[PDB]
Design a protein around this ligand. Structure first.
Ligand SMILES: *[C@@H](C)[C@H]1/C(=C/c2[nH]c(/C=C3N=C(/C=C4\NC(=O)C(CC)=C4C)C(C)=C\3CCC(=O)O)c(CCC(=O)O)c2C)NC(=O)[C@@H]1C
Ligand SMILES: *[C@@H](C)[C@H]1/C(=C/c2[nH]c(/C=C3N=C(/C=C4\NC(=O)C(CC)=C4C)C(C)=C\3CCC(=O)O)c(CCC(=O)O)c2C)NC(=O)[C@@H]1C
Ligand SMILES: *[C@@H](C)[C@H]1/C(=C/c2[nH]c(/C=C3N=C(/C=C4\NC(=O)C(CC)=C4C)C(C)=C\3CCC(=O)O)c(CCC(=O)O)c2C)NC(=O)[C@@H]1C
Ligand SMILES: *[C@H](C)[C@H]1/C(=C/c2[nH]c(/C=C3N=C(/C=C4\NC(=O)C(CC)=C4C)C(C)=C\3CCC(=O)O)c(CCC(=O)O)c2C)NC(=O)[C@@H]1C
Ligand SMILES: *[C@H](C)[C@H]1/C(=C/c2[nH]c(/C=C3N=C(/C=C4\NC(=O)C(CC)=C4C)C(C)=C\3CCC(=O)O)c(CCC(=O)O)c2C)NC(=O)[C@@H]1C
Ligand SMILES: *[C@H](C)[C@H]1/C(=C/c2[nH]c(/C=C3N=C(/C=C4\NC(=O)C(CC)=C4C)C(C)=C\3CCC(=O)O)c(CCC(=O)O)c2C)NC(=O)[C@@H]1C
Ligand SMILES: *[C@H](C)[C@H]1/C(=C/c2[nH]c(/C=C3N=C(/C=C4\NC(=O)C(CC)=C4C)C(C)=C\3CCC(=O)O)c(CCC(=O)O)c2C)NC(=O)[C@@H]1C
Ligand SMILES: *[C@H](C)[C@H]1/C(=C/c2[nH]c(/C=C3N=C(/C=C4\NC(=O)C(CC)=C4C)C(C)=C\3CCC(=O)O)c(CCC(=O)O)c2C)NC(=O)[C@@H]1C
Ligand SMILES: *[C@H](C)[C@H]1/C(=C/c2[nH]c(/C=C3N=C(/C=C4\NC(=O)C(CC)=C4C)C(C)=C\3CCC(=O)O)c(CCC(=O)O)c2C)NC(=O)[C@@H]1C
Ligand SMILES: *[C@H](C)[C@H]1/C(=C/c2[nH]c(/C=C3N=C(/C=C4\NC(=O)C(CC)=C4C)C(C)=C\3CCC(=O)O)c(CCC(=O)O)c2C)NC(=O)[C@@H]1C
Lengths: 161, 169, 160, 160, 49, 67, 36, 161, 161, 161, 161, 161
């Protein structure tokens, strides 16, 4: 994967140039945001289960999905949905820490659409659930870190779509 | 896999329905025919290898080129491979007859047969022809035997033919 | 299904069905009539069974129905009763199939995680299933009650 | 036995035996009386059965006793009859156990190379097993013979 | 019919073996150039060919 | 990380049926503590015999500083 | 030197027998014999 | 699509031989069932709209599906749901006449799952609606014809599963 | 393993003879006791967790072992002890159902003794816990099957010691 | 697509360079081989349908592929197989004239294996037919033109395999 | 894989007859070329590292491929390209000694296009590198064995194209 | 491992000396006997099953181990024993071709003695079977090859002892 530091480093390296002032400003910005990123990561790791629970209750429960004939009917299938949401939240936190949506692209999205298309998982409904997770995490962590987390949550949603 | 009971249970669970009168009737029909299913399974277990040998020893005369050069049973290695495939078919037909369901027949036989046989150049027409010959031998043997019910035996081989055959029309 | 288990055990060794597994299949097919009698009793009594078991649970464990409990409220009580109905239906499926595989696959894989997510006491759910067992075994003969007790106890164990 | 199979499956799944497995064990325990009866009838009527089986097999296969065969010496003919006795003993063991495990672990696994190392024809021995099963079925009663037949059939399967 | 295909890619089971095939297969499996052993196999077999 | 030096013999139960080449069933190796339970279960369920076990690494009774 | 010219040299053309009816058409072959 | 007759002829032609006695047995069985099949088809064709009306009244009407925020809320989506029910009834009639669900596999269940997934169609609600259609059709056509039709309706339902 | 029923067959095969009255009487005794054994096994399977909890409360809880400085002090070691006790209960149940302690000899007394010695596990405390298991299971199942199960539990204790 | 001239031109272009000595050498080699390529292309164009005819005759006539139940049994299936061989011959001729195999990837090989997999077609049998096409082409084309045509047909076979 | 011997015997058996008139011609040619090809293979094996050295010097070194932003830029990618060059030389030796490129098909061209397109390896640069390898080997081994290895090298190049 | 040549090389190398006259004539003797070793190994491989068959026939057929109660009674045990004998024959052939006995300790004698003790295998009967293999192989190959084979067979038997 790649964080902000490795991203700027690779951008300089690919063209072979040393790190200049314009590049160094980006690393300074990342270092400025690092404290907020760590605080948000700690909060989300503390409230990992609660966030997924609230999002599921606010989006999926009592809808068509959980009722018989839906893709959240059996207990195993419900547990799988919860596990998918756990993946989304955890990897969104990873991407927020790294300041770069590369781990999301190479470990959460490269083939996830194909897997859902094969399994019949409703991508629109899972996008709605991720939106619910975005809202819950934003409320829990604040406007700035909430927006940063929502950036990568929307990244995952766009990748799924 | 899923036998008839399991597939009916899955179907009713899909709509979240309790077992109704029609479900009870189908379950009763399967449970009453279970004796004949077990009897046919015992017969085929007793005469399995001989039935497959007879099936091949009619199929290669129906299609002589499968033992001539460039046919896909030429070697003794190829001949044993063909016999192994036919024994596989008989064993899964036995399994399907006891299960009263073709789900096992699909999960463990048909789900990649055309892929594998095309990868190995193995014809998919003589295969089903040998399967039908095995079914005819099985039906004749069961009819000779004291089996009151034997119509179910044609189901697994017919499903094999339908799924593994080419859609001619 | 016992047929499923025997056929799978045979295929895992690549042999045809062994005499012992055929014996088990014959016993299962013979007992199918009693299985259907038990299952039909359960489905006919589904309303009464669920109602009485729910009443017993809401009496023994008033915490779950008191304010601040998971089952508090009319809708939450209805959903608890609906889950009881779900588990009774799964019990009927297991009764018909002669094993607990349908109950496992539908409503006993990840049940702990799902009820943790929903905030439900798994011990309370197991208590509800135990009361369903008692009410149902009160509605049938000695042998049939012992037969259904196996599925009920399996659900109890998987929940607690 | 079926008890061993059920307990092995439960251990493999890391769980207690299920309801269907327990009921199958109960049914086998019930049928233990007829299993015993199989035991005494075969044990006390082996000699005529084995003699008829050997004479019929060697009539069908006039080579092993004939020149260019396998049982020139009396030591070899006695060995063939000893193999009949051992096979029928194993069949009785398996019927008493309820499943095929004693036969599998005593005289089934590797028996093909067993008799390849001794040049005994596997088709000849499977024909011998067929005639032995025919003799045992003829000497046993109809339901008794039907119960005993699947084990001999499975032995025939594993042989060839 | 079946509702999914894995992909019918070609397969080449070895019908039988020859000495060059054996030596080249050993080298290919071991990720090596044909060393003295395989080279001597090939040389002797080619001479007797 | 704690290590269990285990001497055990686990004969195969399917070699004559699968036609697989023989292997040295006996082995005296070091197993991590976390995998030791599963390895003991697998060896016992494969019909093997545990001749000896020793705690090669890790002070017995240690509460913290395991790994 | 030129003895190594196995592939780079002119390839040795082989012979492929044209496919012909086999025993699967014995009935039709006999029908042709009698229609002679 | 393959009916019973074309299925038997296909099994014959992939073997290369003429229809032996068993083929005529299957054909005679199909022709015997043909009169009941045609009666059921004509009754369903006459009572096409009424059956869908009864099914919608039994399952979907006055529910969250048809209330605002439900996928059967807008007039266009209501009409689309009605047309889908008409598809289900007509293709059930086709499968009844042909003695097979091959047409269901080719046309009805061909991409239907992810089609509804992309559109947001409630799978459990549509399955319950199909069950209501099956119940109404069985009541209106008879026990035997109702069961025969319900076989194909349940095939569609399980495929949607 | 090595069943009680298969024990007579194994002995007869070892002496190269058939099951006789001297062993067929034992076979009949096992067949008679089979129903009681199955009843006890079902009861124990139903009440597996409760028996382990009761024995832990009655034997080890509020003792020097569970207190700091004891081998059952840390949470991980307590969980390991609970898992070991559960395995003891399950394998004692297997021995009870099979009518022999051969599976206890094979899959229980294989390397357990020396593993416990290497880990410093209290042998006396383990024996006390197994005795508590035996007493609780005997109370739960009845004296008739309680004695039979306690035979195998005593076998396990003697093997451990 | 791209012939050899186009390949050299594109390489020089992408490096942003004028045609150096090596590019001139490659162009001279292609110009040396050009007349023979034209001769072979004209010969194959004259004998296009014939070559496919004897190819199938040496390969697929009177075989399991053309028996009832095979993938070439029906008249329409046989026509489809002939069409595939006609494309393969024409595109091998085009590749030979252009001196490059890029046209095969652009037109034929970019999705053809997935096409045959979805069609159920036997890749082994089609490779056998193309292999026979190789010798049938070599006979009418010569030796070195035969080698070139065989190279492009082997590219086709590798793409299918 | 396969060699010329097995190809000849396969053709002979599929035709059903003995090695009559041309199978032995090809076989005697193969055996005659065998000793020279073995000597060439030994020379190539001894000079493997060298040949890659001059090939990379001629084709890839001091180019945009090696410069920053090129696919042979980093040290790991340089080592990967060198290892691939060794792979090409080794499989060219295998094809030369087996008389057939079927080893190239099954082991080299089976997924070469997929891996290279997925990674981003410049096809033209790799082809130039393999041409340089062929020229170096031809210079180091002789024109005869140089061409004999060059046929398989060019087969690999065409497969890359 | 090592062979005759490798062993003499190591013996010279431990003193760090060039190949003296003793090493020279030992290599001469090994080279002279190499043809005999190759012939004997070829014969043994050609008739390998027959040696084991005859050795067991004259060693353990109609014997106590074959009798029930022994370690040779069951068909599975008999197959395991014959497999062990066949592998011992193959390793003896490897040793004879090598000219050095270190291979037996390397691959066979590492733990066979203690593993047979753990399995309760009769070491005396194993040694007798090895000896019978000695006479069978000596008769089949010749006295000159017989003694050379018997050297390694005796090494195996002594190691097992
Ligand atoms: C009170 C509001 C909460 C609560 C506590 C509670 N604990 C027990 C009993 C035990 N607690 C432990 C835990 C540990 N012992 C250790 O050495 C460590 C290692 C770090 C831990 C975590 C143990 C082992 C016991 C059992 C007794 C013993 O130690 O011997 C009880 C009583 C349980 C009983 O019924 O006996 C209680 C009440 N329980 C709650 O519900 C609150 C959340
Ligand atoms: C002093 C540095 C030593 C030395 C240098 C030397 N290097 C080359 C050629 C190359 N060096 C590299 C190395 C790298 N390229 C990368 O991208 C990386 C990581 C950033 C490394 C380490 C490469 C790829 C080349 C190939 C040429 C090219 O760049 O295209 C040479 C020339 C060798 C030749 O004969 O061409 C030299 C001289 N030489 C010494 O003796 C010093 C010890
Ligand atoms: C010169 C060769 C060009 C070049 C090479 C290059 N290759 C890779 C990576 C891989 N190459 C392969 C290919 C093979 N592996 C095999 O086993 C076989 C047959 C024996 C082949 C053909 C593979 C599999 C890889 C990836 C995995 C591996 O490490 O082997 C790279 C690295 C790409 C990356 O960025 O990761 C490179 C650079 N590069 C050039 O510029 C030349 C045109
Ligand atoms: C009997 C004295 C002679 C004889 C007759 C015979 N053979 C068959 C059947 C088969 N024979 C073969 C032959 C081969 N398989 C190979 O791999 C090779 C090369 C090693 C050969 C020669 C095979 C494969 C068969 C089965 C398929 C077929 O029909 O060819 C029969 C027919 C048996 C039956 O009708 O069931 C007969 C009568 N074969 C001999 O080898 C003897 C010289
Ligand atoms: C009653 C004995 C207990 C109880 C019940 C309760 N459940 C919920 C909510 C849900 N329960 C389930 C469970 C299942 N759905 C299935 O399809 C199956 C498998 C067949 C099971 C077991 C689900 C999925 C939900 C979510 C709601 C939905 O149906 O979409 C609640 C409400 C929780 C809330 O506040 O939302 C309750 C109260 N509660 C207790 O206290 C009892 C122990
Ligand atoms: C037969 C010659 C005598 C005999 C032996 C006997 N051995 C076993 C079991 C095993 N023998 C081996 C063999 C090897 N282990 C190795 O590491 C190697 C080195 C190359 C060899 C050859 C093994 C591995 C086993 C265990 C099973 C397995 O293969 O995994 C038995 C089986 C005993 C039983 O009843 O289970 C026997 C009988 N016994 C005699 O009486 C013969 C004289
Ligand atoms: C509980 C009654 C006593 C106790 C238990 C305890 N055990 C461990 C660790 C292990 N226990 C085992 C035991 C088994 N493995 C098996 O396969 C079998 C068959 C059922 C048994 C009985 C093993 C292997 C371990 C190692 C852990 C692992 O995963 O491999 C501990 C922890 C020891 C430590 O942390 O150092 C404890 C505490 N402790 C007591 O005080 C009781 C008397
Ligand atoms: C009143 C002026 C006329 C009339 C009305 C009537 N409507 C229904 C039932 C339904 N009406 C609708 C219509 C809509 N739903 C929407 O969301 C919108 C677009 C925004 C429209 C126009 C629907 C969906 C229903 C279905 C019932 C339900 O809401 O769940 C009825 C009842 C019919 C019945 O038998 O149930 C009636 C009476 N009827 C007249 O005669 C007036 C001309
Ligand atoms: C006879 C009336 C005329 C005639 C016939 C003729 N046909 C062939 C060869 C083939 N004929 C077919 C036709 C079909 N195969 C099918 O599956 C179907 C539908 C079931 C049809 C119509 C095919 C495919 C072939 C190819 C041969 C093969 O299958 O291997 C020939 C011989 C061709 C050859 O080269 O041997 C002949 C002579 N010829 C006449 O002149 C009559 C007017
Ligand atoms: C008689 C039906 C056939 C026959 C017999 C025959 N057998 C042998 C030799 C042996 N047979 C056995 C038997 C077994 N080994 C096992 O593990 C078991 C399963 C529990 C059995 C039944 C054994 C051990 C031997 C060799 C050792 C011994 O005899 O003690 C022979 C000898 C052949 C020869 O001496 O060359 C023969 C002849 N022969 C036939 O033709 C019949 C089909």
């Amino acid at each position: 994967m790649q964080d902000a530091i490795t991203a700027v480093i690779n951008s300089a390296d690919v063209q072979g140039k040393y790190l200049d002032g314009a590049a160094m400003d980006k690393l300074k910005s990342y270092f400025a945001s690092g404290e907020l990123r760590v605080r948000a990561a700690s909060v989300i790791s503390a409230n990992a289960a609660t966030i997924v629970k609230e999002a599921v209750a606010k989006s999926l429960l009592y809808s068509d999905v959980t009722r018989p004939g839906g893709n959240m009917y059996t207990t195993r299938r419900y547990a799988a949905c919860i596990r998918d949401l756990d993946y989304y939240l955890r990897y969104a936190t990873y991407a927020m820490l790294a300041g770069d949506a590369s781990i999301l692209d190479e470990r959460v999205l490269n083939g996830l659409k194909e897997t859902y298309n094969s399994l019949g998982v409703p991508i629109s409904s899972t996008v709605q659930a991720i939106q619910a997770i975005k809202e819950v995490t934003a409320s829990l962590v604040g406007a700035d870190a909430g927006k940063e987390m929502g950036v990568y949550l929307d990244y995952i949603c766009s990748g799924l779509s | 896999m899923r036998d008839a009971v399991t597939t009916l249970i899955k179907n009713y669970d899909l709509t979240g329905r309790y077992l109704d009168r029609n479900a009870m009737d189908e379950l009763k029909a399967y449970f009453e025919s279970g004796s004949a299913r077990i009897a046919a399974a015992a017969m085929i277990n007793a005469n399995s290898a001989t039935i497959v040998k007879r099936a091949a020893a009619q199929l290669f005369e129906e299609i002589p080129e499968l033992i001539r050069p460039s046919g896909n049973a030429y070697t003794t290695r190829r001949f044993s491979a063909c016999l192994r495939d036919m024994d596989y078919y008989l064993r899964y037909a036995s399994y399907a007859l006891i299960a009263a369901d073709n789900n096992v027949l699909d999960e463990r036989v048909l789900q990649g047969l055309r892929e594998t046989y095309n990868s190995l150049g193995v014809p998919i027409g003589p295969t089903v022809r040998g399967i039908q010959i095995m079914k005819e031998m099985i039906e004749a043997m069961a009819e000779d035997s004291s089996l009151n019910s034997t119509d179910f035996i044609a189901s697994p081989f017919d499903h094999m033919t339908r799924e593994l055959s080419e859609l001619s029309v | 299904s016992i047929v499923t288990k025997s056929i799978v055990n045979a295929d895992a060794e690549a042999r045809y069905l062994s005499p012992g597994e055929l014996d088990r299949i014959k016993a299962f097919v013979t007992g199918g009539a009693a299985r259907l009698r038990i299952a039909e009793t359960l489905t006919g009594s589904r309303e009464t069974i669920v109602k009485q078991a729910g009443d017993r649970l809401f009496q023994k464990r008033p915490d779950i129905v008191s304010p601040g409990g998971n089952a508090y409220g009319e809708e939450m009580t209805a959903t608890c009763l609906r889950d009881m109905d779900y588990y009774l239906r799964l019990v009927t499926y297991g009764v018909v199939s002669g094993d607990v595989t349908p109950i496992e696959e539908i409503g006993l894989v990840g049940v702990r995680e799902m009820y943790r997510s929903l905030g439900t006491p798994i011990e309370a759910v197991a208590q509800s299933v135990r009361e369903m067992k008692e009410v149902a075994s009160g509605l049938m003969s000695s042998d049939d009650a012992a037969e259904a007790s196996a599925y009920f106890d399996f659900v109890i164990g998987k929940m607690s | 036995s079926v008890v061993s199979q059920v307990i092995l499956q439960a251990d493999d799944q890391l769980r207690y035996p299920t309801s269907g497995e327990l009921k199958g064990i109960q049914a086998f325990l019930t049928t233990g009386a007829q299993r015993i009866r199989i035991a005494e009838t075969l044990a006390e009527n082996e000699k005529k059965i084995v003699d008829q089986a050997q004479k019929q097999l060697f009539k069908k296969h006039p080579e092993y006793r004939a020149p260019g065969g396998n049982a020139y010496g009396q030591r070899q003919y006695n060995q063939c009859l000893r193999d009949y006795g051992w096979y029928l003993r194993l069949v009785t063991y398996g019927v008493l156990a309820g499943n095929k495990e004693p036969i599998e672990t005593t005289g089934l696994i590797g028996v093909k190379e067993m008799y390849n190392s001794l040049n005994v024809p596997v088709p000849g021995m499977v024909d011998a097993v067929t005639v032995l099963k025919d003799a045992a079925l003829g000497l046993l009663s109809a339901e008794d013979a039907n119960e005993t037949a699947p084990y001999f059939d499975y032995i025939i399967q594993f042989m060839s | 019919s079946v509702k999914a295909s894995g992909g019918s890619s070609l397969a080449r089971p070895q019908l039988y073996q020859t000495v060059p095939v054996s030596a080249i297969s050993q080298a290919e499996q071991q990720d090596r150039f044909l060393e003295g052993s395989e080279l001597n196999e090939l040389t002797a077999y080619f001479q007797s060919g | 990380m704690r290590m269990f030096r285990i001497t055990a013999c686990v004969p195969s139960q399917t070699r004559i049926r699968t036609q697989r080449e023989l292997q040295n069933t006996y082995f005296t190796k070091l197993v991590p503590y976390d995998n030791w339970f599963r390895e003991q279960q697998r060896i016992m369920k494969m019909g093997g015999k545990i001749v000896k076990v020793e705690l090669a690494t890790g002070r017995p009774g240690t509460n913290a500083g395991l790994a | 030197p030129s003895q190594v010219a196995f592939a780079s040299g002119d390839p040795i053309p082989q012979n492929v027998a044209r496919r012909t009816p086999g025993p699967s058409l014995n009935r039709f072959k006999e029908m042709a014999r009698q229609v002679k």
